[PDB]
């Protein structure tokens, strides 16, 4: 199936408390493989997957330089943005960058993306054709003109269409056992008496990989969402994921309600009813 | 319009002397680099810096240290102070980001010498055009010779009627060893200025060949009987003749 | 660490020049620089994608498919194209530099009349220089002789206001038997004037 490689960067200023906190993190699909943390001792890109340890010292030095360079650009960005929005020097602000590439089941290039945010809001992003920029406001327009004049899109597209997909390809074969797996959800259902008039049915999905899953509640074949509650998919801590969905139901009518489970580790979608 | 100034452009000093080279840059946030360039090796990175008080080492950092107390300045100090650090040194700059191309300064010629009594200024002589040349070609070539200098930190220029000219001149790119078997050997350099016979036959025209030599400075020690071979200009001149 | 080849090449004025680099390492950016003497490297072209780029007009450059190789082409070459050219390869936010390729353009001499002249010292004595001048570009000048004779290599001056370029070489010696008929005869001279 489809695969992805993504890198996530967070920088947060702490004026009066030294230089900004910087955390970088690498993922293949839903598996983390590298980190960098500026408050840690090593000051290096560190491994977070067993299959990436085998990379030699040229990889680790190279990744350390690139990541420390990402860090400095954000330090300057935090100062630049503080000025663009006329914010005070005393307050804490955030810069977030996310980029990467998607491939298909043949592992040919599918898609590329690069998004940038200031304080939790979209600032500037690369458009899907990978040749232009979306600028949200007046200050982002200044950034867009700067990045157009330095021809930044061209360099990014080159990384996104070449280097990114080739390293994705390499990681996928190196981490074959864990990266190309599908773990089907283990499904069960629970029942709780809220009142004598109301009842809650909870549909559980456990031990699954990848994290992408769909949980829907159906009544008599027609799906309904009006009394539905869905939690965020959560990591189990062992490389698998967990999720539930619940409905509030008139008790007695528990026979009318079916839960539908969709995941790429299911050959056919699962149905589940309280007997 | 790079915005880089390297100082000094030339330094001649004995072993044991710490030498600081300065790279000044005017455009706020920048990555900065120091390289050395040597005949069989190309450019080799000494030290580099991603911002104020943040430096790291390149491949040939042994014997060198580096300072970035502010964004404008990247100081390379030659710690070991040794004859193998004789090189041309190049500062470079890069925009803050990842993978942006580097743009270089104009260079620093540095010679570290094990013996200063080897250091000699050039003698400069101007040789007048042949009468035969004037009648054969209607042209007139003057030659300038700078002889017996060590090391080669010379800059030769031609001044006609008080003004520098570049047209009609060619100066040897490489100086010539006066004693090819010798290691410490003194140098010679030749240059030509060619003018029309008419312009040479005008006696109002004044021709000067100037050699700027870079040598010892104030704090360099000197105990010989010859004049201290300091950074100086040696010149020779000639006037036009009606023949 | 990059292997650049060759260390010094030669082109005749007006021709096409091709120039390459090599490594066993992968590089994500290729740069080409030119260095003029007394000055630092100046960036000519920056290559990012594996394909064809032209940011001078007269300079075209290519990034290899394997990303271990690159080239530089110069068309309709011109005497100012003289200089040291350098490739740079980019990986891990670091650039690695080739060892230099040194171009010299050999000039086209319009009309030679090669000759050897004796030039006298302007302001002193019996001191004397010999000048071999106006020879065609195919003529090479030798040096070694006996050790007491200093012969320089050939260079071209360009008299810009007269559209005239000429090659020349200089020889001198001391209290010898040295003369201008015996100065350059260990170099291969034409059928020229004394």
């Amino acid at each position: 199936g489809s695969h992805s490689m993504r890198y996530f960067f967070t920088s947060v200023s702490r004026p009066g408390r030294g230089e900004p906190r910087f955390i970088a993190v690498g993922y293949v699909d839903d598996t983390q493989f590298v980190r960098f943390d500026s408050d840690a001792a090593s000051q290096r890109m560190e491994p977070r997957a067993p299959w990436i340890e085998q990379e030699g010292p040229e990889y680790w030095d190279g990744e350390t330089r690139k990541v420390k360079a990402h860090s400095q650009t954000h330090r300057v960005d935090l100062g630049t943005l503080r000025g663009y929005y006329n914010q005070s020097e005393a307050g804490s602000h955030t810069v977030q960058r996310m980029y990467g590439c998607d491939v298909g089941s043949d592992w040919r290039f599918l898609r590329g993306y690069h998004q940038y945010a200031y304080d939790g809001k979209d600032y500037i992003a690369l458009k899907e054709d990978l040749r232009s920029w979306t600028a949200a406001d007046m200050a982002a327009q200044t950034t867009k003109h700067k990045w157009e004049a330095a021809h930044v899109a061209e360099q990014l597209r080159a990384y996104l269409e070449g280097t990114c997909v080739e390293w994705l390809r390499r990681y996928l074969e190196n981490g074959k056992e864990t990266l190309q797996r599908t773990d089907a959800p283990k499904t069960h259902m629970t029942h709780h008496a809220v009142s004598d008039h109301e009842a809650t049915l909870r549909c559980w999905a456990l031990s699954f990989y990848p994290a992408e899953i769909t949980l829907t509640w159906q009544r008599d074949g027609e799906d309904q969402t009006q009394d539905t509650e869905l939690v965020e998919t959560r990591p189990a801590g062992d490389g698998t994921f967990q999720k539930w969905a619940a409905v509030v139901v008139p008790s007695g009518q528990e026979q009318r309600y079916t839960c539908h489970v969709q995941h790429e580790g299911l050959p056919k979608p699962l149905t589940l009813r309280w007997e | 319009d790079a915005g880089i100034t390297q100082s000094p452009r030339h330094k001649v000093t004995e072993t044991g002397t710490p030498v600081t080279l300065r790279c000044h840059q005017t455009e706020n946030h920048r990555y900065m680099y120091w390289y050395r360039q040597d005949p069989g090796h190309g450019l080799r990175l000494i030290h580099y810096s991603y911002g104020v008080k943040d430096t790291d080492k390149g491949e040939v950092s042994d014997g060198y240290s580096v300072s970035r107390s502010k964004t404008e300045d990247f100081l390379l100090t030659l710690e070991s102070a040794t004859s193998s650090q004789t090189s041309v040194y190049f500062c470079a700059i890069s925009e803050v980001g990842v993978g942006q191309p580097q743009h270089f300064g104009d260079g620093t010629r540095l010679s570290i010498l094990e013996d200063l009594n080897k250091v000699f200024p050039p003698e400069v002589a101007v040789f007048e055009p042949s009468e035969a040349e004037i009648s054969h070609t209607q042209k007139a070539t003057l030659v300038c010779l700078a002889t017996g200098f060590y090391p080669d930190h010379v800059e030769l220029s031609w001044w006609v009627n008080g003004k520098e000219v570049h047209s009609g001149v060619c100066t040897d790119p490489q100086p010539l060893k006066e004693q090819p078997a010798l290691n410490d050997s003194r140098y010679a350099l030749s240059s030509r200025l060619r003018v029309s016979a008419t312009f040479w036959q005008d006696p109002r025209n004044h021709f000067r060949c100037q050699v700027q030599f870079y040598g010892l400075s104030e704090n360099d020690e000197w105990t010989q009987d010859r004049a201290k071979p300091v950074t100086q200009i040696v010149s020779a001149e000639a006037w036009g003749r009606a023949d | 660490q990059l292997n650049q080849s060759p260390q010094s090449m030669f082109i005749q004025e007006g021709e096409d020049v091709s120039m390459n680099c090599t490594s066993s390492s992968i590089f994500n950016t290729w740069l080409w620089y030119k260095q003029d003497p007394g000055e630092g490297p100046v960036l000519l072209i920056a290559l990012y994608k594996a394909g064809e780029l032209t940011s001078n007009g007269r300079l075209t450059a290519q990034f290899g498919i394997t990303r271990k190789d690159s080239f530089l082409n110069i068309s309709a070459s011109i005497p100012s194209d003289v200089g040291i050219y350098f490739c740079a390869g980019g990986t891990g936010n670091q650039f690695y530099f080739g060892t230099g390729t040194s171009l010299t353009v050999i000039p086209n001499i319009q009309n030679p009349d090669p000759a050897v002249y004796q030039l006298r010292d302007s302001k002193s004595s019996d001191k004397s220089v010999c000048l071999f001048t106006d020879f065609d570009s195919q003529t090479n000048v030798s040096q070694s002789k006996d050790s007491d004779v200093y012969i320089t290599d050939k260079c071209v001056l360009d008299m810009r206001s007269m559209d005239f370029k000429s090659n020349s070489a200089v020889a001198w010696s001391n209290k010898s038997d040295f003369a201008c008929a015996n100065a350059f005869n260990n170099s291969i001279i034409p059928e020229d004037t004394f």
Binding site: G62, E63, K66, T80, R157, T163 | E95 | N28
Partner: peptide, 9 residues
């Protein structure tokens, strides 16, 4: 491997 086409805002 992380990117190499990043510039300041």
């Amino acid at each position: 491997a992380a990117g190499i086409g990043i510039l300041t805002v």
